[PDB]
Amino acid sequence: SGFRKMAFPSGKVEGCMVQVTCGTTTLNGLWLDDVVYCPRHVICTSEDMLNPNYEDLLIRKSNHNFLVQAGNVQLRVIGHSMQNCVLKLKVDTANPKTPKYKFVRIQPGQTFSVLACYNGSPSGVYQCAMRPNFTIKGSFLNGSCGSVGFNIDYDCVSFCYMHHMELPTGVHAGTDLEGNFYGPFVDRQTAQAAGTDTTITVNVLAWLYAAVINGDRWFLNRFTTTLNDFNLVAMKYNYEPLTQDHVDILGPLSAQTGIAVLDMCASLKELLQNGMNGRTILGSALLEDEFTPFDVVRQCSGVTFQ
Amino acid sequence: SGFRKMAFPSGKVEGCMVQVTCGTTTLNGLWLDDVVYCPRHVICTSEDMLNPNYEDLLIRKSNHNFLVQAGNVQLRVIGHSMQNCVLKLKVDTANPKTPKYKFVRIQPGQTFSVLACYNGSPSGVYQCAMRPNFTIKGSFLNGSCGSVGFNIDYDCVSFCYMHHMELPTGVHAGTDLEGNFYGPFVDRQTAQAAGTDTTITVNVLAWLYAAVINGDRWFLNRFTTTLNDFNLVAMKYNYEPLTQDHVDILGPLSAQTGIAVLDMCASLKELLQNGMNGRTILGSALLEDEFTPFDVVRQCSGVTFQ
Ligand SMILES: CC(=O)Nc1ccc(C#N)cc1C(F)(F)F
Ligand SMILES: [Cl-]
Ligand SMILES: [Cl-]
Ligand code: NA
Ligand code: NA
Interface of B with A in 33-92 (CB under 8 A): 71
User: Alpha-carbon distance A140 to A123, whole Å?
Assistant: 11
Query: Are B123 and A7 within 8 A, CB to CB?
Result: no
Which chain B residues are within 8 Å of A302, Cβ to Cβ? Answer: 118, 123, 141-144
Catalytic residue among B16, B145, B265, B300: B145
Q: Which of B72, B112, B126, B144 to mutate: most A Cβ within 10 Å?
A: B126
Query: Are B10 and A9 within 8 A, CB to CB?
Result: yes
Nearest residue by C-alpha to atom 2 in ligand 1: A189
Question: Where a domain ends, among A180, A197, A214?
Answer: A197
> CB of A49 closer than 6 A to ligand 1?
yes
The CATH number that applies at residue B8 is 2.40.10.10
Query: Are A137 and B285 within 8 A, CB to CB?
Result: no
What b/e readout covers A148-165, taking b as 16+ CB neighbours within 10 angstroms? bbbbbeeeebbbbbbbbb
Q: Are residues A78 and A56 in the same domain?
A: yes
Query: Which atom of ligand 1 is nearest to A173's Cα?
Result: 10
User: How buried is B289 (Cβ within 10 angstroms: 0-12 exposed, 13-18 middle, 19+ buried)?
Assistant: buried
Which chain B residues are within 8 Å of A138, Cβ to Cβ? Answer: 2, 4
Residue B283, min C-alpha distance to chain A (Å)? 9
User: Alpha-carbon distance A174 to A181, whole Å?
Assistant: 6
Q: Are residues B237 and B263 in the same domain?
A: yes
Which chain B residues are within 8 Å of A217, Cβ to Cβ? Answer: none
Answer whether residue A137 is part of any domain.
Answer: yes
Q: What's the domain count of chain B?
A: 3
Measured in Å, residue A246 CA sits from the centre of ligand 3 at: 25
Residue B230, min C-alpha distance to chain A (Å)? 24
Answer whether residue A130 is part of any domain.
Answer: yes
HSE at residue A295, side-chain half, CA atoms within 13 A, is: 31
For ligand 1, mutation pick of A135, A165, A171 (most atoms within 8 Å of CB) = A165
Query: Are A284 and B280 within 8 A, CB to CB?
Result: no
Answer whether residue A264 is part of any domain.
Answer: yes
User: Alpha-carbon distance A33 to A79, whole Å?
Assistant: 14
Answer whether residue A306 is part of any domain.
Answer: no
CA of A306: which chain B residue's CA is closest?
Answer: B121
B252 phi, psi to nearest 5 deg = -50, -50
- Write out the residue range of the structural domain in which residue B149 sits: 1-14+100-197
Question: Where a domain ends, among A144, A172, A197?
Answer: A197
Query: Which atom of ligand 1 is nearest to A39's Cα?
Result: 10
Residues, CB-to-ion distance under 5 Å, ligand 2: B 106-107, 110
Alpha-carbon dihedral A27, A32, A37, A38, rounded to 10 degrees = -20
HSE at residue B74, side-chain half, CA atoms within 13 A, is: 8
User: How buried is B234 (Cβ within 10 angstroms: 0-12 exposed, 13-18 middle, 19+ buried)?
Assistant: buried
Q: Give the nearest partner residue to B7 out of A124, A302, A305, using CB atoms.
A: A124
The CATH number that applies at residue B296 is 1.10.1840.10
The helix/strand/coil state of B91 is strand
HSE at residue A155, side-chain half, CA atoms within 13 A, is: 6
Answer whether residue A157 is part of any domain.
Answer: yes
> CB of A12 closer than 6 A to ligand 1?
no
HSE at residue A303, side-chain half, CA atoms within 13 A, is: 14
Q: Are residues B10 and B146 in the same domain?
A: yes
A54 phi, psi to nearest 5 deg = -70, -45
The helix/strand/coil state of B59 is helix
Q: Are residues B35 and B117 in the same domain?
A: no
User: Alpha-carbon distance A2 to B123, whole Å?
Assistant: 14
Query: Are A10 and B15 within 8 A, CB to CB?
Result: no
Q: Are residues A50 and A154 in the same domain?
A: no
Q: A224-230: list long-range contacts, CB under 8 Å, 24+ apart.
A: A224/A260, A224/A262, A224/A263, A224/A265, A224/A266, A225/A262, A225/A265, A225/A266, A225/A269, A226/A262, A227/A262, A230/A262, A230/A265, A230/A266, A230/A268, A230/A269
* SS3 of B240-271: CCCCHHHHHHCHHHHHHHCCCHHHHHHHHHHH
Query: Is A80 annotated in the active site?
Result: no
DSSP code of A296? H
Question: Where a domain ends, among B61, B84, B99?
Answer: B99
User: Alpha-carbon distance A166 to A192, whole Å?
Assistant: 10
Q: Which experimental approach was used here?
A: X-ray
HSE at residue B54, side-chain half, CA atoms within 13 A, is: 15
Measured in Å, residue B72 CA sits from the centre of ligand 5 at: 8
For B27: left if phi > 0, alpha if psi spans -120 to 50, otherwise beta; the answer is beta
Q: Are residues A177 and A131 in the same domain?
A: yes
Catalytic residue among A16, A22, A38, A41: A41
DSSP code of B188? S
Q: Are residues B52 and B164 in the same domain?
A: no
Measured in Å, residue B283 CA sits from the centre of ligand 3 at: 7
Measured in Å, residue A155 CA sits from the centre of ligand 5 at: 13
Question: What is the DSSP annotation of A161-216?
Answer: EEEEEE-TTS-EEEE-TTSPBSSS--SSSS---PPPP-B-HHHHHHHHHHHHHTT-
Catalytic residue among A44, A117, A128, A145: A145
The helix/strand/coil state of B14 is helix
CA of A214: which chain B residue's CA is closest?
Answer: B170
The sign one gets for the Cα dihedral A155, A161, A166, A167 is negative
- Termini Cα distance of chain A: 22
Q: How far is CA A39 from CA A82, A129, A161, B61, in A?
A: 9, 21, 11, 57
For ligand 1, mutation pick of A41, A84, A175, A192 (most atoms within 8 Å of CB) = A41
Interface of A with B in 281-300 (CB under 8 A): 283-286, 299-300
Q: Are residues B10 and B72 in the same domain?
A: no
User: Alpha-carbon distance A170 to B120, whole Å?
Assistant: 39
User: Alpha-carbon distance B75 to B91, whole Å?
Assistant: 6
User: Alpha-carbon distance B2 to B71, whole Å?
Assistant: 37
Which chain B residues are within 8 Å of A126, Cβ to Cβ? Answer: 4-7
Measured in Å, residue B94 CA sits from the centre of ligand 1 at: 47
Query: Which atom of ligand 1 is nearest to A46's Cα?
Result: 3
Query: Is A145 annotated in the active site?
Result: yes
The shares of helix, strand and coil residues in chain A, as percent rounded to the nearest 5, are 25, 30, 45
Query: Are A9 and B285 within 8 A, CB to CB?
Result: no
Answer whether residue B306 is part of any domain.
Answer: no
A265 phi, psi to nearest 5 deg = -60, -35
Q: Are residues A10 and A37 in the same domain?
A: no
Residue B115's H or E segment, with its range, is strand B111-118
DSSP code of B109? T
Answer whether residue A296 is part of any domain.
Answer: yes
User: Alpha-carbon distance B253 to B265, whole Å?
Assistant: 13
Catalytic residue among B16, B22, B38, B41: B41
> CB of A172 closer than 6 A to ligand 1?
no
Q: Are residues B210 and B171 in the same domain?
A: no
Nearest residue by C-alpha to atom 7 in ligand 1: A189
Q: Are residues B261 and B122 in the same domain?
A: no
Q: Give CA A53 to chain center in angstroms.
A: 28
Structure's resolution in angstroms:
1.5
Q: Are residues B269 and B156 in the same domain?
A: no
